[model samples]
Target: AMLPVIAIVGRPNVGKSTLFNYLTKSRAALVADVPGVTRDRQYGETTIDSQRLLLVDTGGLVETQVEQAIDESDCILFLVDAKAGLVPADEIIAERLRKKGKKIFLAVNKADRARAAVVQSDFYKLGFGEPYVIAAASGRGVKDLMTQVLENLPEVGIKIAMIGRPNVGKSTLINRLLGEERVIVYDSIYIPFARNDENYTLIDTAGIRRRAKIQKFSMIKSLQAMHAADVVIFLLDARQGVTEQDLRLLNRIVEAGVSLIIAVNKWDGLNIEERDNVRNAIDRRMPFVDFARRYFISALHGTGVGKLFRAIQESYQSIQQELTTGQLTRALEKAVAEHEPPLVKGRRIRLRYAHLGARHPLTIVVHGKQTKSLPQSYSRYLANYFRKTFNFIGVPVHIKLKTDP
Candidate 1:
């Protein structure tokens, strides 16, 4: 098997370089607080639990640059500003992970500071299972973070996309994912930035525009990116909820025909009650998409967004669907038995069987009666069940409904 690569990323002055040195025990990365100091993607190799692995450290990557580098990594160590406190950018970073769906470990850096409690408390919202605190400058909590890294990393390198609306914290999330500043992010647009093929390609583009149709550049980019990317994500503002423009963008994404992931950003603005309602609304709104596969995240507050990227990888796997016929057919039978599909033209919709169709994305074809009339709600239900049973969380599953024609 190929060696696992664990990348580090975060905002400037978050001790990413320090953490890189501590984790890899090397001085390969330049540690400096001047923003945009580290402009290159750096790597070091190490062994954990008899497994050889590569650790990547990068410059403080803004959106476009950070997006590019993260696209190539296997796992991400998202570092946050523990001293500065979690911000909207951090939460926005979490929101984009839905597209790439790779394993993630959230490291709250600068935990040794006097305001560490506030920083740590703010991260409970990122929702990557749990937050690991560490002071990269002092080597505190580094061991614990590495322990999780070694234990949870997937055996093979998975392709990922750090996607969300521009300036929604996508780029900073990439830096946090790599645990180093690989991309330079400023609060401006059209700024000259750098790129590296070895890390990830931060796709430089404007936010989701309100145009009725995609323009020439968008078409060109769409053709190029859709062919290359394994997954694509649409991130929304949790405070703002879904908008008409967001829905329009979703239509374009559906046309892209790649794995789909969603990140709800700016979660810190909502309370627990509002959070639960929004989570439910997401399921109701995306009736055509699988609910079990979606993620709720606060890119700014750092809530529930940590594991969003890992989900993308799992979703990508769902489409290939290489399960044994016996294993899958049994589950298919159960799915039909639990909740039978609604009649199409007053005839039974018999979903005969399914098998693995391809890799990257797993596809399944269910032969039934008048599949066109099948409610989207039923389709999503079956999709969710199949995804869970077949270990297809991060990957996208393509379901083709065919009628007895």
Candidate 2:
């Protein structure tokens, strides 16, 4: 099961970013009353009617970017402003889409009023079919549109990609999980393993060196494997504790927006003192990924691999879980009750609501009155609070602030 990728495209300020934020249930993209706010392709995950799919919010389709998006997407949401009616730019985008041979859905944005009825009718001239009348600013017609969008796409299984430095036992761990030698154990290989009611594709990636010391071709292959994964298992050698190369790899994983787990392998070789030292080193060197669950395991003997997979399952489930505004509000209320948000400019910043926004990086969007001035320390407090409340083990949690209008 492969999660269908949906690309949102249209002319500038046609509400593509608004629709992106609405569908993903977060303000992951920068939205202003201006054109070209989104200069790059932003990816997020959303589930509708119990089916999850990936959505890519791209900049206004102008150059080769539109072609690249069409090549990557299973479906395209061609958005046009209902209030603005179909413009010349919309016509150009439609013409370009006609050449791509991709499934195209016409979405009429800003269709909250009866006036949009007349405007929506004109969009059928683009030849994409019946346009979905939607209000991206409000929760209007988005779900009905997704109901039809999901009907054509398929579901997906969990995909785990292994990453680490050279000889940190990425391949060894895969062999242990499969209980046999299935891949080239020394360097790297992509192996799909399915057994015992669990269906997963395991990609054993090459050990990546620091960028200065890296071999270009091998690093490219490893990065490609990592980018294709749903969850990345970053293995570390307990004997060496956390190294600079290990931290570099972790940074790469975070930037990739993938669920992650840190497995400290060769734990059986460490004595009690050495174990304590390794733990301290991890806290000191790689404290950024403290949200990621850490497992002490011996891949050579399979000491803690079972628990590792259980953690993997939990981590993947965290990415799939959807939290509502009410649920998040209650959690935030409880956290505020315990420790209130600090005051700024002689006034306490008021947090109105919290919502689960993106799944790929597990973002929590907190809506506040003056959130732009919110301190980083308070943001960390909210992140820890949500992590504890949600029991989101082995995945990095990102908290973002949005000012309520």
Candidate 3:
């Protein structure tokens, strides 16, 4: 996240701005205007596939700074005019740099005309391999070009997905978490970033393709990505109150068995009474949310966001960690003593032993008599008790019933 630096290094009139607009705007997933992350039109942030990189659109880069920019950037996007049939500077600028061990993507812009693929071969003389023939204005061949641009940056870490309904400020929260501000967005993709040495991938599910017709498709895609996530940050608008869709999404995340963080965005805008009302509403509407570490953050003003960073790290660590059978038995015994399982069929269900069933979902299977008939409330109690004992802040600790055998 904010780790890779990619600067546009082509000469002027190579449709640099045109290509910038097409990549940054037409594709909401590709552009996040964060001046702090790196700037005006000259600097931007984007991650085509969770590979976060800083893109500097240096206007009319025809200087040692430009040369310095090229040398330092993780990669270079060299644009050449296909309509001009590869000018002298194309080769003149080409020979000036030490291209070894550098990823230089030579883009052939203004190639919207027929037989443009023919011009793609012409750019081969620049020696960046067959240049990608693209029509920046029309956005032709632009998508794959960026996918290629982001592939070179190396990072792997905890996968965090931001899930919320339309306009719940997932993008805003993501930008803030990445140390960014003052950006435009309607994005539905991801970012790779770091807090100190730990790397994180942020997946936003706000749906960039916002047409109402294919909303269902986007939802399926979002949930599938949720399944892939190690932790999911569920955002709720503090003033809007929780909706039926919000509860459904919440249940899906729980059912998917990933770590969780319930963040209430727009908390700064709420008044004294409104804050309590929102808190009450959350408890009333989302009974299962008590397991999540509830954070009231204003993604816009950067309030209460620091807690989320800690929560994310804690959850990721807790979920992937080892919980021995010895430890689970102690926690289970302690939990049972704290509050025994409810009576079933006129007798208390005997919860004799427990051991960790899985780590991905953090499951604890209990060996007991009449376990199948255990009340949901008892299961919840055991889960919550274990959660507190283990200090599983961001993760959901599930209690699975298994009759003695």
What TM-score fits each model? Answer: 0.42, 0.57, 0.54
Best by lDDT: 2
- Highest TM-score scorer: 2
The residue pairs that clash in candidate 2, if any, are 1-156
Rank list by TM-score: 2, 3, 1
Residue 393 alpha-carbon offset, candidate 2, angstroms: 2.0
| Between candidates 2 and 3, the lDDT winner | 2
lDDT for residue 181 in candidate 1, whole number 0-100: 31
Task: Write down the TM-score for model 2.
Answer: 0.57
Query: What ranges in model 3 sit over 4 Å off?
Result: 1-155, 180-190, 204-217, 336-350, 373-378
Supply the TM-score for candidate 1. Answer: 0.42
Q: After best superposition, candidate 2 residue 134: deviation in angstroms? A: 34
Off by over 4 Å in 2: 1-156, 180-190, 205-217
Q: Quick one: ranking by lDDT, best first?
A: 2, 3, 1
Per-residue alpha-carbon lDDT of model 2 for 69-149, expressed as tens digits? Answer: 667778999889888887898998888889887889999988876665585788877888888888898878888899989
- TM-score-wise, the better of 1 and 2 is 2
lDDT of 1 by residue, 161-186 (tens): 44444445555444444433353333
